[PDB]
Every structure is written in structure tokens, then in C-alpha cells.
Ligand binder design. Structure first.
Ligand SMILES: [K+]
Ligand SMILES: [K+]
Ligand SMILES: [K+]
Ligand SMILES: [K+]
Ligand SMILES: [K+]
Ligand SMILES: [Mg+2]
Ligand SMILES: [Mg+2]
Ligand SMILES: [Mg+2]
Ligand SMILES: [Mg+2]
Ligand SMILES: [Mg+2]
Ligand SMILES: [Mg+2]
Ligand SMILES: [Mg+2]
Ligand SMILES: [Mg+2]
Ligand SMILES: [Mg+2]
Ligand SMILES: [Mg+2]
Ligand SMILES: [Mg+2]
Ligand SMILES: [Mg+2]
Ligand SMILES: [Mg+2]
Ligand SMILES: [Mg+2]
Ligand SMILES: [Mg+2]
Ligand SMILES: [Mg+2]
Lengths: 88, 35, 372, 124, 64, 117, 88, 134, 96
RNA sequence: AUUCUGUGAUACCUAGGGGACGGGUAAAGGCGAAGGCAAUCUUUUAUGUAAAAACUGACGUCGAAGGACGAAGGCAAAGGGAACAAAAAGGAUUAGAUACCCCAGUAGUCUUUGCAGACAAUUAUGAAUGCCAUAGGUUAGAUUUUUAAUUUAGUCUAUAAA
């Protein structure tokens, strides 16, 4: 501000304020969803030890396929009920 | 008439679904001490 | 030229199915939901029907017979086919009653579709021979270009900044040579109008440098040039310097093929009460009450704004089947986005009683037990 | 005017709670070992809960539930104390302080690249 | 930019022509002090364009 | 080529920011360049407090300058700016795809609109 | 964003747990009782109500299980038609 | 009169369950009022098309726009995945490189949104301040 | 003819760069006159000392989408004329 | 446990200095002869891909040798030194423990200039040419009634003939 300056630090972005329609218990839930969507906990676990480039590339390939397989599996499960509903 | 019969089904769902949020919302706080 | 087998398939019924038309256009930059989808503004697939003796067998003229559980039992046999045979070796179909019965419920209102008006209410049919025309001659001037409804060029105000650049690069840029010829044909009319007006007291029509100068003269008056450019690219009028150039021309026929009546100027002759003052009322359902401060009502399956005037102000869970209101459909029109918009108005009191009397819902019948 | 701060640093083996002034000067800097918890008893969820209740109690003695009108809760780390101490402030102990909370921040430290970490352990 | 002195000069002469202020369509009400000034504003505005464009199209200001 | 330099100078003295714009401007014109636009953004917050020349700055006086110049001229603007102790930070960029059609649509520096491309 | 992949040929297309294995509805009540003892004490009076709720758990009968979900039967019908095949 | 206030609470409660915005011209059937349709099974507010093509702008040429950078980063300063932006791989790379340029040049923060954008967003008087401490 | 089209396209780019040359600065005289006008202490409605004050924010995505989703209502008029002119210039070849 | 801390640590801050590293984006994605290549600005460099025309007119493929390039570790010299870490050493565990684990820690990793030439340097598959039926994805374009199809060059999945 004109008198006091804003504290611009990584925590400034991870801040959630209490207002009329949002109480302390409500700001905690919003803080947990954003901290989860941004995968802050996963980074703390991956930055604890060093993973050389080859191991990181191969770990991503295993996790990226399980994500496609799981996403393609949910589409087949729900496509099965679209056909069952039609009576096939 | 078909809309009436279908609107009622929604009313029952909304009435039964809103009770879930208000109950789970009020119970969010750990006020079980009953001070 | 074609084998007898190919000649039969051409005139076949399954070959006459219309292609799937694009869905009703929506906000291009706005977000939507891709998993779930509700009823569309207007239908995109053809609704199919069978004989009652064939429906019991599941035969719908398709590749395979349809399941009986999801196609039998109802009153109106209607089906929409998305793929006659999908990668699952099944006919991806769905019920077609959401639009098949919305058409019958709308036509039950017995109201035409009028041209959009501006705000002296003058409801003019959209099937008039002077306005409803699509074939035009190259001699077609500008004053009569406002009556049309089907233009070849796009509406510049409706395009996005991206679609407009693609248009300037692939449609108007390679038409410069053709436009210069279009001017020469005008010069043929400019040199003959002054050269043949005194004979009752054609020109070469091929020039190269004269055209370059004539265009410069028009730089002082930009309006006369836009009318000349739009007439060539067949652009829909934009501003008055008239045919509702606010939201743009309609992407379909002004009627959209939902109603073909040309006027509502008629009286309903009641069996006992003689002619009526207004058309019979229609009961509507209240959706999204004011408490956006605007209300929405469902009339014959279409959503419209509530009458300009409670039940439409605050939600009431005590009312069974939701809040309902008797109204009268004054005007119906088709906007530029293909939607059907109704200008509903509140219904009178005596009329709702007359309508309820026939169906047996009036409490105090106006006949017999009405001393005053 | 900046509020007070209720930093809650928690990791796998211990939890630190710091209550600072608006200028970020520590008033109550305690840990699980201040309550007598020895080498390994500091990582327990229960020990982190008692530390939170102890700090809240020590604040009342100092008359901070009346002096503090605006307070911020800063979370650092994802240890057991991250949830334990929150249930103290959100429970019956933080009844007086729960009304003066205006912000909820997360100050977990991450590195965009940074120095190399330890080599992976082979436990088996 | 794949230009040459010929194409460049032809474009300058073309831009000056289409942008040349057209005088009054007649001589009856032609306002002299308003036309002669537009000729100088166009001439001055033209000289500024030739100078700026000669510097942008200069091949010495290009890269590899 | 078409370049664009964003300069962030120390706030407080308007004479300083005017001397840098004129110095970097006269350098572009004398070398044979063309300045397309110079916008004067005022003094607002920096991305974060940064220390330069033994001073802790929280704000800075921004200004954008778009010019057509040669590589040697562009490298001298960056060198002179960086060497000046009154600039907190400078950002330079080569606009466009290097083609004539895209380069002809760069006029005034936008704030309430985008660069058409 | 891409669309869900077409699953490769699998030995069998099925979900591991067809019916949601819901949790004992009282393990949550006990946590509340254990929460009061940590804040209000053991022999206190505030926790006298939660204890009654906990005693009410075990005195009530256990809800009967739901009928099995037939999802796996329908997944096995549309496997070859929904995926690239079936492994032998 | 307090009995009238609780009615407003019950009313707005149901209004929240009607997860649909009715518009003029929208056709609806008796099925469009049932729970299965109001539930809104779609758990994603997907974007219609690639806005970079619809708006027709070059990201790299608009790196100096602080609002555009903050729109394609999370509150933590992390570039948004193509799932959220709904862009093609080519346009995703141009907007990702546009964010990295602005942050790399040092004109936009990297762990939150621009300070001048935080001054306007909700929580203005509550922004973290820096006490001089001396 | 194919090389003429490439030459005509290369010409229109110079005509557009010719029109835009009105606001360029080519001499020190225009530079000084430009700086002394825009670089003053009370240019941003001084109160305000930054472009964020006079002009609220740089146009965002929400502001770019509302221009084509929310409104569609009169701003389309000024937008319809600039587009109606671009079609004439690029079709006529001039700079109407 | 060795170890750090009353010479005030951990925790919470303010103000300066230093070295490397590269979060999200990110994908079955891309680039190069391979090795390999992921923050950012400017400068600089050879191929490759699409569509149309124009141009040269067999100017092509492979290629012993020579020469060039070639991961990590390593040698030599001069810098750098935060972090990590062979060696050396200490504390534990164990029947014993060089070890796996832990407190610390030097070469080395990084910079510049040379040497060196060995790799699961892998697709366990040399390079290139002609040719053989489909399907579902995906990458960069092109065409179109740009919805979606058609098509060129890549890449992957599952099959037919074989
Ligand atoms: K301590
Ligand atoms: K490799
Ligand atoms: K170490
Ligand atoms: K040892
Ligand atoms: K392919
Ligand atoms: Mg170690
Ligand atoms: Mg072991
Ligand atoms: Mg000290
Ligand atoms: Mg450094
Ligand atoms: Mg990365
Ligand atoms: Mg390649
Ligand atoms: Mg060769
Ligand atoms: Mg050899
Ligand atoms: Mg080496
Ligand atoms: Mg070395
Ligand atoms: Mg050495
Ligand atoms: Mg190296
Ligand atoms: Mg060598
Ligand atoms: Mg290797
Ligand atoms: Mg070989
Ligand atoms: Mg690849």
C-alpha cells in the first residue's frame, strides 16, 4: 500500500481470507482443495530425494499410462450403461 | 400433468438432498463437547 | 447409366434421411458442459415412426430391430437415430418425443410466427411474397435487399475476431479482380444513364484506370461504397443508413418450419357463448422465480419470460407439482440464433373459467348456475 | 495494521508452533519437546494436539485473547501436527481465538529446481 | 522483407495516390484556405512516411 | 528489426525517467532507427522487492518503447540502459514473426486491448 | 484435451469392488467421543452426551447388506465391442 | 415476522438445487425436471473452443499483459494444464511460453498473481503487509 | 501471375505501414515534443500515479469473453463500422 | 547413537553476499547422424515437414580406410565451491558387517582449454530402395460444403494375409 508495502512471497499466493459467507472452517476447506489441486504435498515428497533424469522419465511413463488406462476404463464403464439404458 | 409428476420427484430429491448438506455442514465443526 | 440396384437405392426411404444439421449456435467463447446434455433449441435428427404391428416386432426400417423395452409401451412411437451402426454393432438411438411432441404442443397454440418488431404492434406474416424470397437478380438494387432473409455473406458483428480474419484472408482478399469487374458493369450504367436520357427528348464497360479514380471519389462518402461492397459480397445490412439489423439475419427460415399459419386474426366460435374475444388461455409452469430478478415460464415446452406484472416472485415448496399460471401467447418469433421466443401475457379471469368449464374443472359453471 | 500470526510448522518428526507480533517477532515459540516429549514421542499425533492446547492455554494467561483482534494462521509442512493443531483452534480450546482469525495461509517451502537432495535410500 | 527498390517505390507512389486529399468536387464553394492546408499536411505527412519506411525496409537493419 | 523495451526506473524523480527515454530515443534515431511508440506507465508495484545499486525498491516507474532498429543499435540500447544506475530492471523482446504482414500491424502499445495477430 | 483411449485387449473387463464397501457407521461416532476426552477430559460432564450416542450404536441392529451389483455382468457382454479385443 | 425470514432461507435452498439456467427459446420436456437432469452429472465446466483461435491473437506478442498472465496461472503461479484452458497443443505451448517469458523477464511474479491484480481482488484490506520493523 | 499476387500482397503491407507512419517518431523534435507531453507527474489523473489508476486493468480473458458472450447492447455499433471498413479496404485495395 | 545448542540453537523476521539447479506447462509430445537436447531475452547455425508453381536434369544409395563427433566416470591445468557425494573416518545394526541405515565428509559433479574413446552408446533389431489388407488413437500441416471429412509426412496400439 501507499504507507505499508504488500508482503510478496510464496505464501501470499496460498492465502484465503475470512469473509461473511466464508468462516474459518470454510477457508480451511478452500485452502485444502487448492493445496491439493496444486499438488503441494506431492512436490514435498518428490523433492525429498534426488531422482536422476532417466528414473524420472520412466516413472512418468508408468504413471501417465495408468492415468490414460483409468480414464479410458471409466469411459467404457459409463458407455456400457448408455447402451444398457437403450436396452441393448 | 407429466411435468407435475416429475416435478414432485425433484422436490423430494431436493428436500432430501438439502438435509444432507445442512446436517453435514453444521456437524463440520467439532462442537460435540456440549460445553 | 446406373444399375437397376443403384436406381432403387437412390429413391429408397433410408437414403432420403436428411443429413444431421449442425446444432443451434451458442456463445462461442462461453463455457459449457460436455458430459451431460439436455434438449436442444431445435431438432437436428429426423424423428422416425413405424406401424403398430411392426413396433411390437421392433422393426423400424433400420439395420437391426430395436429393443422392445425402450421402444414399446408409450403412445407416440418416436425415435432418433444417431448412428445406424456404431463401433459396438448397435444402433445408437434415443427417444424423439422431446421434439416430436414439442412440435405438436406448439401447433396446438394456433399462432403464426411474425417478423421481429422494434419498440404500434403490427404482426406481419413471414411467408409474404415480398419478404420471403431467396432468388435475386444481379440487377437487384439495395432498397429491395432488406426484404430478403437468406444472405450468402456472414454477419460481421456476429463473427469472432478469429473468424473475421480467416474471412478477410480466404474470401474477400482473392476477390479483388472480380470486384474491379463489378465496378466496370456499374460504369456501363453510369455512362448510359446520362447518354440515353436525352435520346427520348451500351458503353464499352471495360476500363482499367477509370475504375481506380472512381473508387477514390467514394472515399469522401463511405456509405455509398459499403452499399456497393456489401452488395457484391452479399453481406446482410448492418445499420439503417432497417430489416432488424440488430442481432443479425436468421440462420434459418424466419418460421424455422415449426408453424405455417399466416395470421391469428380469427375468432373462436364457442358452442354456447358464440365467438370469443381472445384465443383460449394456456396453462404455464413457473421456472426460476424472480427472487436475476426476471422470471421464466414454460409454455408448451418452450421457455419464455413471465408476463409483465405472488407465485412468480418467491419459491413455494408447499405447491404441488410446482407453481402454474394461466396465460395467453400474444406473439411468437424466431430470433437470429434459431430459438423460438414467445411474448407471453397474463390471461383474463373469465377466459380461464370458460376453458376450465369444458374440461370439467370450473368450480362455479358459467352456465346454469350463474344468476349474475 | 497487520494481524498476528499463528505459524504451525509440522513435519514427520516434530511440530513447532510460533505466535508472533504484527512485525513478526516471536511471542510464544514452543515445540513438542517443550512439553517433555522425548526423542520419538514428538512425532505422535497426540503429542502435537497437546502442544496446540498448551500454546492456546499459554496465550490466555498472557491475556492475548483480548489483545489480539486480527490473527493469521500459517501452515507449513504436512506432518501430523498440521491436522492436530487445527482441531485445537477449531475445537473447544480456540473458542476465544477462533473469532479473531482473518486469514489462512500455507507457507510450505518448495524449490523450483534448487540444490540437489539426498540420494534415495535403500531400506528394503 | 523480400522487397526491392522498384516494388518499394511503386508502393509509396500508390499509397500517396489513394490517400491524396480529394479537392472539392466543384469550384463554386471550394474553400481555398482549407484545401491548400490539406495539401501541405498530406505532403508533410507523406515525407514523414517515406523517411520512416526507407529505414524499416533497409536491409542493413536485418538479421542473418 | 522491430524491438520493444520495457524499462523500470527508480520512482520519485520524473526528470530521471525523461532523461533515459530521451537518451535511448536519440540513440535510436541517430543510428537510423524509427520509434513507433513510447508509453508512460506510472509507478506501481514490482513483482517483488528487488535490491539494486544498494537500494531496496518496492515500486518502479515503468515505460514501454517500441522501435525499429538494427541489431547493433538494439544491443547498444540494452547496454546503455543496463549500465545506468537509475534503472531497476529492463526487458527486451523482438516483436512479430519477422515477416512483413505481421510487422505492419504493430502500432500503439496496447493496455485495454490485445495485439492483433 | 484428448478423448479417452480405446482400452487394449484385456483378459476380463470388470471392477474389483462392484458394491461400495461402506464403513461402519459408528467408527465416526467413537472418534467424536475420543475427541471430547482429549479436550474436555475423561470424567468430565460435557462428554456425557456423546457417550450416550456411542452406547446407542451397538444396541441398534446392523443394517442388512444390499443386493449385489450386476455391473460386472454387463461389462463382460460389451468387452469385445468396447475394447480392442479380449486376451486369451 | 421472523417466520417470514426462514421462508427466504428455505426458498434459496431449493434455488441452489436447480443446477440449470433457463433461457428464452430453450426447449424442455417432462424429463428435464427430474433429478437425473438437475443433478448435473457433468463434473467439468469444459470450454467451448480454443479461445486463442477465436480471439485471434499471438500470445508472445501480448506477454506484457499482466491480466493475461494471471489468467493462465493458478493462484500459486503454476501454469494451467490444457484440461483447464481447453487449448490445442500448439496454442497451449504459445500461452505457456508467454507465461514463462513474462516471469523469466522479471515483470510478473512466479508464485502468485501480479501485486496490482491482488490489490483489486477480494481481500484488499487483508493483504499481507510488511511492517518496517525499525 | 502467381508472382504478381505475392507482389500485390507485399504491397498492401507497405501501404498499411505507410498509413501507420503518422504516429511514428523519426526526428528528435518529435521525440522531445512526445516525451514532454506524456511524461508528467499529473498525467494519470493526479488521485493516481499509475496507469492502473486511469485505466483500471489490462484487458483480461473475462473482459474478452464478455464482449462476445455477455453483451451478445450498443458497443457493437463502433465494432460493426471498423469491420465494415476493413472488408472494403482489403477488397477495394485502398485505405478507405 | 555419534552430532548441533546457553559463545543463545530449532522456530519467526529484517538487511546484504555466494554457488549451482530449472516448479507448473507435459503428452502414447517434439528436435538432432548418434551421443543426447526442457526456466528466460538478444545474437548465431545445418537438416527436416505441408501445399502450390517454377528450376536443374540421374547430379542417386551403400561405403573398408582416413578424418570428425561421441554419455557418465577419469587424467592435466587454471577457476569455482552453496548443495550433493566415491575415498578416508565416526555412530549403530549384526553371530560377524567391508556393507544396506545414520552424524559428518575429500576428490568429483559446474566454468575455460586439452587428453581420453571404452557403454544395456538398445528398437538387445546397420543404412537404403521397391512392394502387401485394415482398424482405433496421437503429432505438424494442407484441402474442403472448415460441422466433419479428405490428404501428405511422423509416431503408437490391436489385427488380416503372411
Ligand atoms: K523448541
Ligand atoms: K539415448
Ligand atoms: K552429506
Ligand atoms: K561403518
Ligand atoms: K496414423
Ligand atoms: Mg547419505
Ligand atoms: Mg534389510
Ligand atoms: Mg542469533
Ligand atoms: Mg545464481
Ligand atoms: Mg519442467
Ligand atoms: Mg526429424
Ligand atoms: Mg549417404
Ligand atoms: Mg570409418
Ligand atoms: Mg566426458
Ligand atoms: Mg571433467
Ligand atoms: Mg584440479
Ligand atoms: Mg557435463
Ligand atoms: Mg578427441
Ligand atoms: Mg546412453
Ligand atoms: Mg553403416
Ligand atoms: Mg515420439
Amino acid at each position: 500500500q501507499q504507507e505499508l508495502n504488500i508482503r510478496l512471497r510464496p505464501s501470499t499466493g496460498r492465502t484465503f481470507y475470512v469473509s461473511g459467507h466464508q468462516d474459518f472452517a470454510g477457508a480451511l476447506k478452500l485452502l485444502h482443495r487448492t493445496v491439493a489441486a496444486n499438488k503441494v504435498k506431492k512436490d514435498v515428497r518428490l523433492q525429498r530425494f534426488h531422482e536422476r533424469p532417466a528414473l524420472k522419465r520412466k516413472r512418468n511413463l508408468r504413471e501417465r499410462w495408468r492415468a490414460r488406462f483409468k480414464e479410458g476404463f471409466k469411459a467404457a464403464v459409463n458407455r456400457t450403461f448408455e447402451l444398457k439404458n437403450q436396452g441393448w | 400433468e407429466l411435468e407435475n409428476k416429475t416435478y414432485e420427484s425433484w422436490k423430494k430429491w431436493a428436500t432430501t438432498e438439502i438435509a444432507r448438506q445442512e446436517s453435514a455442514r453444521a456437524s463440520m465443526y467439532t462442537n460435540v463437547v456440549d460445553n | 447409366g446406373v444399375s437397376p440396384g443403384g436406381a432403387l437405392l437412390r429413391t429408397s426411404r433410408m437414403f432420403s434421411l436428411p443429413p444431421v444439421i449442425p446444432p443451434p449456435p451458442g456463445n462461442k467463447l462461453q463455457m459449457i458442459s460436455e458430459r451431460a446434455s439436455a434438449t436442444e433449441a431445435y431438432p437436428t435428427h429426423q424423428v422416425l415412426t413405424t406401424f403398430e404391428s411392426s413396433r411390437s416386432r421392433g422393426d423400424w426400417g433400420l439395420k437391426r430391430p430395436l429393443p422392445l423395452k425402450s421402444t414399446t409401451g408409450t403412445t407416440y412411437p418416436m425415435v432418433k437415430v444417431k448412428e445406424m451402426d456404431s463401433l459396438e454393432q448397435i444402433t445408437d438411438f434415443t427417444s424423439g418425443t422431446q421434439h416430436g411432441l414439442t412440435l405438436k404442443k406448439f401447433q396446438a397454440l394456433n399462432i403464426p410466427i411474425s417478423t421481429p418488431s422494434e419498440i404500434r404492434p403490427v404482426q406481419r406474416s413471414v411467408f409474404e411474397a415480398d419478404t420471403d424470397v431467396t432468388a435475386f437478380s444481379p440487377d437487384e438494387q439495395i432498397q429491395e435487399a432488406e426484404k430478403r432473409w437468406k444472405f450468402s455473406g456472414p454477419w460481421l458483428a456476429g463473427m469472432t475476431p478469429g473468424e473475421f480474419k480467416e474471412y478477410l484472408a480466404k474470401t474477400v482478399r482473392p476477390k479483388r479482380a472480380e470486384f474491379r469487374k463489378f465496378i466496370q458493369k456499374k460504369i456501363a450504367a453510369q455512362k448510359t444513364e446520362a447518354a440515353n436520357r436525352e435520346l427520348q427528348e451500351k458503353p464499352e464497360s471495360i476500363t482499367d484506370d477509370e475504375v481506380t479514380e472512381y473508387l477514390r471519389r467514394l472515399r469522401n462518402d463511405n456509405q455509398v461504397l459499403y452499399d456497393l461492397v456489401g452488395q457484391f459480397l452479399d453481406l446482410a445490412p448492418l445499420k439503417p443508413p432497417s430489416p432488424y439489423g440488430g442481432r443479425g439475419p436468421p440462420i434459418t427460415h424466419p418460421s424455422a418450419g415449426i408453424s405455417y399459419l399466416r395470421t391469428a386474426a380469427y375468432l373462436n366460435n364457442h358452442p354456447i357463448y358464440g365467438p370469443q374475444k381472445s384465443h383460449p388461455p394456456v396453462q404455464a409452469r413457473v421456472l426460476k422465480p424472480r427472487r436475476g430478478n426476471d422470471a421464466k415460464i414454460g409454455v408448451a415446452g418452450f421457455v419464455a419470460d413471465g408476463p409483465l406484472g405472488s407465485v412468480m416472485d418467491k419459491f413455494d415448496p408447499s405447491i404441488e407439482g410446482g407453481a402454474k399460471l394461466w396465460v395467453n401467447v400474444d406473439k411468437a418469433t424466431v430470433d437470429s440464433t434459431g430459438r423460438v421466443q414467445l411474448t407471453v401475457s397474463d390471461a383474463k379471469a373469465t377466459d380461464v373459467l370458460i376453458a376450465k368449464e369444458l374440461i370439467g374443472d370450473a368450480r362455479e359453471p358459467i352456465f346454469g348456475s350463474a344468476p349474475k | 495494521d497487520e494481524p498476528y500470526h499463528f505459524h504451525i510448522y509440522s513435519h514427520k518428526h516434530n511440530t513447532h508452533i510460533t505466535v508472533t507480533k504484527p512485525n513478526r517477532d516471536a511471542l510464544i515459540s514452543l515445540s513438542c519437546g517443550n512439553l517433555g516429549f522425548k526423542k520419538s514421542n514428538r512425532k505422535h499425533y497426540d503429542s502435537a494436539y497437546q502442544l496446540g492446547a498448551y500454546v492456546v492455554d499459554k496465550m490466555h494467561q498472557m491475556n492475548l485473547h483480548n489483545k489480539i483482534k486480527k490473527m493469521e494462521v500459517v501452515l507449513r509442512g504436512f506432518g501430523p501436527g498440521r491436522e492436530a493443531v487445527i482441531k485445537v483452534l477449531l475445537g473447544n480450546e480456540g473458542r476465544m481465538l477462533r473469532s479473531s482469525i482473518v486469514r489462512v495461509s500455507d507457507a510450505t517451502r518448495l524449490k523450483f529446481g534448487g540444490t540437489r537432495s539426498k540420494k534415495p535410500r535403500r531400506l528394503g | 522483407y523480400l522487397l526491392n527498390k522498384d516494388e518499394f517505390d511503386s508502393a509509396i507512389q500508390y499509397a500517396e495516390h489513394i490517400l491524396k486529399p480529394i479537392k472539392a468536387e466543384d469550384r463554386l464553394t471550394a474553400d481555398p484556405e482549407k484545401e491548400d492546408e490539406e495539401a501541405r499536411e498530406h505532403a508533410a505527412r507523406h515525407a514523414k512516411a517515406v523517411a520512416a519506411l526507407e529505414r524499416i525496409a533497409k536491409l542493413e537493419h536485418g538479421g542473418a | 528489426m522491430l524491438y520493444e523495451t520495457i524499462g523500470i526506473v527508480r520512482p520519485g524523480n520524473i526528470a530521471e525517467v525523461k532523461e533515459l527515454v530521451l537518451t535511448a530515443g536519440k540513440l535510436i534515431l541517430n543510428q537510423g532507427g524509427v520509434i513507433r511508440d513510447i508509453k508512460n506507465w506510472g509507478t506501481f508495484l514490482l513483482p517483488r522487492p528487488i535490491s539494486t545499486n544498494q537500494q531496496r525498491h518496492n515500486r518502479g516507474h515503468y515505460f514501454v518503447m517500441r522501435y525499429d532498429a538494427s541489431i547493433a543499435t538494439h544491443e547498444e540500447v540494452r547496454r546503455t540502459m543496463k549500465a545506468d544506475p537509475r534503472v531497476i530492471r529492463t526487458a527486451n523482446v523482438k516483436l512479430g514473426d519477422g515477416k512483413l504482414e505481421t510487422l505492419s500491424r504493430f502500432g500503439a502499445i496496447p493496455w485495454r486491448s490485445l495485439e492483433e495477430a | 484435451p484428448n478423448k479417452p483411449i480405446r482400452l487394449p485387449p484385456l483378459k476380463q473387463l470388470r471392477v474389483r469392488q462392484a458394491n461400495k464397501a461402506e464403513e461402519n457407521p459408528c467408527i465416526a461416532v467413537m472418534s467424536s467421543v475420543l475427541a471430547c476426552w482429549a479436550s474436555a477430559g475423561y470424567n468430565s460432564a460435557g462428554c456425557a452426551t456423546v457417550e450416550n450416542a456411542l452406547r446407542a450404536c451397538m444396541d441398534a441392529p446392523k443394517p442388512a447388506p444390499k443386493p449385489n451389483n450386476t455391473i460386472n455382468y454387463h461389462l463382460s457382454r460389451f468387452q469385445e465391442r468396447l475394447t480392442q479385443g479380449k486376451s486369451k | 415476522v421472523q417466520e417470514l425470514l426462514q421462508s427466504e432461507v428455505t426458498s434459496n435452498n431449493y434455488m441452489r438445487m436447480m443446477r440449470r439456467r433457463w433461457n428464452n427459446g430453450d426447449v424442455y420436456a417432462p424429463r428435464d425436471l427430474s433429478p437425473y437432469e438437475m443433478k448435473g452429472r457433468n463434473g467439468g465446466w469444459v470450454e467451448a473452443a480454443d479461445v486463442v483461435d477465436e480471439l485471434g491473437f499471438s500470445p508472445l506478442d501480448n506477454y506484457r499483459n499482466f491480466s493475461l498472465i494471471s489468467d493462465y496461472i493458478t493462484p500459486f503461479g503454476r501454469i494451467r494444464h490444457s484440461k483447464e484452458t481447453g487449448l490445442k497443443p500448439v496454442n497451449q505451448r504459445k500461452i505457456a511460453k508467454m507465461v514463462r517469458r513474462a516471469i523469466g523477464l522479471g515483470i510478473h511474479p512466479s508464485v502468485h498473481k501480479h501485486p496490482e491484480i491482488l490489490k483489486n481482488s477480494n481481500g484488499r484490506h487483508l493483504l499481507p503487509l510488511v511492517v518496517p520493523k525499525g | 501471375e502467381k508472382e504478381a499476387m505475392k507482389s500485390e500482397a507485399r504491397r498492401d503491407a507497405v501501404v498499411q505501414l505507410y498509413v501507420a507512419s503518422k504516429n511514428f517518431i523519426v526526428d528528435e523534435k518529435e521525440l522531445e515534443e512526445h516525451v514532454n507531453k506524456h511524461f508528467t507527474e499529473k498525467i494519470h489523473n493526479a488521485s493516481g500515479r499509475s496507469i492502473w489508476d486511469s485505466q483500471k486493468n489490462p484487458i483480461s480473458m473475462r473482459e474478452l469473453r464478455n464482449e462476445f458472450s455477455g453483451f451478445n447492447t450498443t458497443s457493437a455499433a463502433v465494432k460493426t463500422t471498423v469491420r465494415q471498413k476493413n472488408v472494403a479496404e482489403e477488397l477495394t485495395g485502398g485505405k478507405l
